[PDB]
Amino acid sequence: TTTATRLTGWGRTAPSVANVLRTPDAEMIVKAVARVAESGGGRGAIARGLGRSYGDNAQNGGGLVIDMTPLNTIHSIDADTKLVDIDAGVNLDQLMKAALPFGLWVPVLPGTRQVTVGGAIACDIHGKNHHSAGSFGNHVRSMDLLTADGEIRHLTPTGEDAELFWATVGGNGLTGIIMRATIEMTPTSTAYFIADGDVTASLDETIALHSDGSEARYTYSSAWFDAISAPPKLGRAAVSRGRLATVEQLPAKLRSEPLKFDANKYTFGPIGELWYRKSGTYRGKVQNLTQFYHPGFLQYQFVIPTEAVDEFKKIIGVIQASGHYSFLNVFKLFGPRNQAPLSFPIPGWNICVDFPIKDGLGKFVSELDRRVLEFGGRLYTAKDSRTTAETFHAMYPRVDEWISVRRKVDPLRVFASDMARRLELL
Ligand SMILES: Cc1cc2nc3c(=O)[nH]c(=O)nc-3n(C[C@H](O)[C@H](O)[C@H](O)COP(=O)(O)OP(=O)(O)OC[C@H]3O[C@@H](n4cnc5c(N)ncnc54)[C@H](O)[C@@H]3O)c2cc1C
Ligand SMILES: O=C(Nc1sccc1C(=O)Nc1ncccn1)c1nc2cnccc2s1
C-alpha cells in the first residue's frame, strides 16, 4: 500500500525518499499511524496535501508520508449557517465551485486554488483580503484531528482543546492529521469583483498609498512592485484593490447568472510609461475571479511590522543593489494577526520575491534573514527551505509555547518532517 517516492516541494529542491501511503479509506490512515506509534517512533509520519509548499514541510526522509488528496469528499454545505463540512483532502478550487451556487464564498483564497483544506489550515494561509478577513484559521469552526495515540479529537477555536486547535493552525502537520473540518464561508450574491486600479511611480508613493487611509474602503488589496529598477523607480507598483460585487452593480448581460464562474520599440520609453499608467488606472471595473485574482528559482516571503516603514524601505534598497533580479514581486499590507503561535502574518508590510538560482544567492538570503529578524519580521515556512533553527526561533518568539503544546500531544514524536528536524520543532 506504500510506495517509496522521491518527494520535493513546489520549488523542486532538497528531495528526500519516503514511503508514501495513498488511500481513500480513512481507517487505513488510523492504522498506519498506529503502526508508526508502536514502531519506537522511528522517523515518524507527516501528512501531504497537493505539494504546493515550496519548503520541506510535506516530506519526511526515511519515514512515512500520508497523501491526503484521496480524502476529498464534501460532506455538506448549508447556506443558512454558512457552514461547509469537508474532508481535509478537498481542494479550494473544488470547494469554490461547489459552494458558489449556495451564494457562499471561500473566506480566504491564496495565489493558487490548488491547495488542500488540510494545507490551508496547517500553513494558516492568507490572501488578498488578509487585512479585512485574517487568515484561513480565522474561519475554521471545527476540525477533527488524528493525534499520536490514534484517537480522533474534535477541536474548536474556543472552549476545552482551544490550545491544540490554535497549535494545529499554522502547525505544519506537526500536531497530527487533520481528517475533517468545518469552515464558515462568506456570503455573496455574485462571483464578481468591483475593482479599482492604481499605478505609483515610486517606493515612497506605494507606501504613501497604503497608509493614507484608503485601505479601509476595500476588502481585497495587493500590488505588483518593481524590485529591479534603480531609485527613483524602485518600488513603483501596480495596485489592484476591490470588493465582491452585489447583483445591482453587475451589467445586465451578467445579472441573469450572478454566481456562474466559467515587447516593442516603445515599451521602455516615455510612451509606454504613459500606456502602463493609463491601463493600470481605473475605477469600478467589473472583474471575474480569473481577471481580478488568478492570472531554478528561490521564492522568498517576509513581513516587516507596520511601524518599521523606514526599515522596510531599507530591505527593498538592499534587494535591488544585490545584483539578484526578481521580476515577479507581490506586496500587500497585512492586518491584525490571530492567536496561533506559528501563524506567519502580523500587521505590516508583506513582500514576496522570486530570485533565479545563481552564485552567491544562498549567502545573500541569509543576510536578508538577519535583516528581517532585526526588524521584528519573519519568514513564511510555506516559502522557505533554507533558514536555520536559531533564526526561525528568534522570528517566532511563541515557538517554546507551541513546542510545549506539541510535547503533550506527541510525546514519542510520531509526527515528524524534514522541516521539523531542520527547524528543531521536533
Ligand atoms: C503558485 C503558488 C501561490 C501561492 N500563493 C500563496 C498565497 O497567496 N498565500 C499563502 O498563504 N500561501 C500561498 N502559497 C503556499 C500554499 O498556499 C501553502 O504552501 C499550502 O499549505 C499548500 O497546500 P497543500 O495542500 O499543497 O499542502 P502541502 O504543500 O502538501 O503541505 C503543506 C503543509 O500542510 C500540512 N498538511 C497538508 N495536509 C494536511 C492534513 N490533512 N493534516 C495536517 N497537515 C497537513 C503538511 O504536513 C505540510 O506541513 C502558494 C503556493 C504556490 C505554489
Ligand atoms: O503569497 C503570494 N501572494 C500574495 S501574499 C498576500 C497577497 C497575495 C496576492 O495578492 N496574490 C496574488 N495577487 C494577485 C495576483 C496573483 N496573486 C504568492 N506567492 C506566489 C508564489 N508563486 C507564484 C505566485 C505567488 S502569489
Author numbering: 7 to 268, 284 to 316, 331 to 461
Provide passages from the article that reported this PDB entry.
Mtb Decaprenylphosphoryl‐β‐d‐ribofuranose 2‐oxidase (DprE1) is a flavin adenine dinucleotide (FAD)‐dependent enzyme, which together with decaprenylphosphoryl‐d‐2‐ketoerythropentose reductase (DprE2), converts decaprenylphosphoryl‐beta‐d‐ribose (DPR) to decaprenylphosphoryl‐beta‐d‐arabinofuranose (DPA), an essential cell wall component. Multiple covalent and non‐covalent4 DprE1 inhibitors have been identified and showed in vitro and in vivo activities against Mtb, further validating DprE1 as an attractive anti‐tuberculosis (TB) drug target. When analyzing toxicity profiles, we noticed that many TCA1 analogs show inhibition of CYP2C9, one of six major cytochrome P450 enzymes which determine the clearance of 75 % of marketed drugs. Here we report the X‐ray crystal structures of WT DprE1, a TCA1‐resistant DprE1 mutant, and CYP2C9 in complex with TCA1 analogs.
Modification of the carbamate group was carried out; however, most of the analogs such as amides and esters are not active, demonstrating the importance of hydrogen bonding between Ser228 and the carbamate group (3.0 to 3.5 Å). When replacing the carbamate with various heterocycles, only TCA020 with pyrimidine showed moderate activity (MIC=2.5 μm, IC50=370±133 nm). To help optimizing the pyrimidyl substituent, we crystallized DprE1 in complex with TCA020. The DprE1–TCA1 structure revealed that the two nitrogen atoms of the pyrimidine ring occupy the positions of the two oxygens of the carbamate group as H‐bond acceptors. Based on these structural insights, we introduced a methyl group at 4‐position of the pyrimidine to gain a hydrophobic interaction with W230 (TCA787), which has similar activity to TCA1.
